[PDB]
Amino acid sequence: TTALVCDNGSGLVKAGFAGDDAPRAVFPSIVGRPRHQGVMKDSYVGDEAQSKRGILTLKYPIEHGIITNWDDMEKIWHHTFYNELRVAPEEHPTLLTEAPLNPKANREKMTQIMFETFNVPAMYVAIQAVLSLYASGRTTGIVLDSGDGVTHNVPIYEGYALPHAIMRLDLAGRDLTDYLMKILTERGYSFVTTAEREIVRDIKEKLCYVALDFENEMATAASSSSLEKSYELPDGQVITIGNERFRCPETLFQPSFIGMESAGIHETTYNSIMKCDIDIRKDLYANNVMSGGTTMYPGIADRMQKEITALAPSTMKIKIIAPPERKYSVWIGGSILASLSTFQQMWITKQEYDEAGPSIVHRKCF
Amino acid sequence: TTALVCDNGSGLVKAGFAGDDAPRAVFPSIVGRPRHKDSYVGDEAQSKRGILTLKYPIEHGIITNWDDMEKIWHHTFYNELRVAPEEHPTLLTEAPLNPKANREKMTQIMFETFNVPAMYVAIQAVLSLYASGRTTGIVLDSGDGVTHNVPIYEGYALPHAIMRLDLAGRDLTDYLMKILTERGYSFVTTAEREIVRDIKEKLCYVALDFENEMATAASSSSLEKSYELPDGQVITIGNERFRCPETLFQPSFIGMESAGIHETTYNSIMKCDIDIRKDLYANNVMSGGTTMYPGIADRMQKEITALAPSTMKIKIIAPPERKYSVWIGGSILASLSTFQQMWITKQEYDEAGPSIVHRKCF
Ligand SMILES: Nc1ncnc2c1ncn2[C@@H]1O[C@H](COP(=O)(O)OP(=O)(O)OP(=O)(O)O)[C@@H](O)[C@H]1O
Ligand SMILES: Nc1ncnc2c1ncn2[C@@H]1O[C@H](COP(=O)(O)OP(=O)(O)OP(=O)(O)O)[C@@H](O)[C@H]1O
Ligand SMILES: [Ca+2]
Ligand SMILES: [Ca+2]
Q: If you measure from the C-alpha of residue A253 to the centroid of ligand 1, how many angstroms do you get, rounded to a whole number?
């Protein structure tokens, strides 16, 4: 009996089979329906909704990690089981993930749908950051999770997230793509359409990096061509990318670049640690673990180590852990968790759900 | 707000307040009712035994008489602890392999009969293990009514591997009575049973080599101890001292064909995966009143060494507190910050019902 792991994000669904080192299916968390359906019942999910976007209204059922459109979330889950993983959900225990401050009612609804619409034999809901931390081989540390829609700091002590100390930055991967489009248009190129967004996304993921000292790099890029990289557009046209390589992800450290007054990710990290008890801060500073697609920039751990060092006590041991496989560490932590012997008894079974109802899900220990 | 901890056993209730180092209330787990209405509990039921029919609501650790158990809980709250139970979260304990229906009924009664604001049910052996500073190990819990081995891996009792010996302290008392009577004394009445219990708890010990000690005992008087009876007669107890608890290792002494406590320990380990066997062998924790005999840890060490692979590191931990370690584990646990999260609340119970209790995590 193979368990399933589904990590539902704001931008991407990551789904697959417990025991694997990577999600088998990764696709856009988008549902499309024909314009004016409901005021006048077809629907499309992920790459297909995107490819058929022309007369569909496209929606993201999860916003900042939290499910907000239930009907469309059902379509995402259905598609995930039957089209992407090609499984009968009633044959498999299914681990799902949730965002840092997911309301109880939300968790209960997810639970009801899994058992009553999908008929899963068993399920579990884990905190995304705790899974990432587990994947890094720890039960204590502070997770920076930067995805497509939202960025969170989640301090965890001996297995337990500290909810009072969670910090949020309302910017992540999709904002960085849009800003790369903006500033790259400003050079003289034109990146504005949805096809051009796809290209820009590929540039972001291939050529961007976090500057160790931002002002030294701006100067270098202005002095020399040494920081410049070639890039071939789908049509064979080669173009050149300079300081926008590192200005784009600089937004995480300086959200003012997209007109936001929020604290950059180094500040959210510090702030989150400072909300925690002095007795555990040393442990958190030494176990700063980065996760999510938007932590993937070369140079980001180096830059964070520099910033945290500036904010923290002079003698604090600081360490930033950025695992190569951090892009899907939330999913991989789930894969690990759902595969080990000790967790077998942690699943919530259909019989338990039948006797207790959905609030059974809250009594949870991973 | 102070949480209550009630560890209900077959022979004794141990009850008190979390944060305390020991239970404030320890009394017999007995309810008496007139022979032909009022019921009495514990010491008062005993003082009235001549006009009451006395019953033990818990047998081998499992609650079997529910009306009488409700009387014990009521008396514990109101008369022993002097608390209104609707003002305190309450941690209760349970036997290994306590049935699900039983655990649910306990929960129902706490919320619906005693109106507790919150409660929890913890496995006795897990609490003992926790009190000793461990989350993996094998507990031997020997009480008044039953003996169990409970192997525990990272906080979780492994139910397929739990072993039981249907003899414990009350059996050893009776047996001491019998063999003292055979020596020529006579201990038959209930008054004489209390005397013999005192002798058992004061003068018995577990021999390292039984057959050597018997030979020593017949040889000289060097193992004889004097004991003043309440009336002031001084009697002599000899190989009595160690024959009595030898029953733990040799249940045949009282006509039982079951495995002794060294064999149940070993058998329990061997029902567990090889992956954790070394850690179990190194972390044998003794708990319960009937593990108090001087000599018992050394004798276990010997017996387990003989059964285990010759190279295996063996360690038997017998905390001086072990008579109340279940209770003390509960006290420690219920005082922790992170435990406030783990209580089942009345609102949770109202939403889910009694089956909510099983998703426990202590
Ligand atoms: N190598 C990379 N470099 C930079 N960005 C990347 C890289 N790989 C992925 N990303 C970005 O990461 C984002 C997807 O990450 P992730 O799956 O962690 O987010 P999510 O779970 O969908 O969203 P959220 O956690 O905000 O709800 C996309 O914006 C993607 O463009
Ligand atoms: N020092 C001692 N030496 C020997 N036996 C002792 C000693 N102290 C207590 N006992 C015995 O321990 C028994 C009670 O232990 P405990 O409270 O652990 O049992 P219980 O929880 O009531 O029963 P059970 O665990 O079997 O349901 C009594 O039979 C008592 O005589
Ligand atoms: Ca995510
Ligand atoms: Ca007991």
A: 17
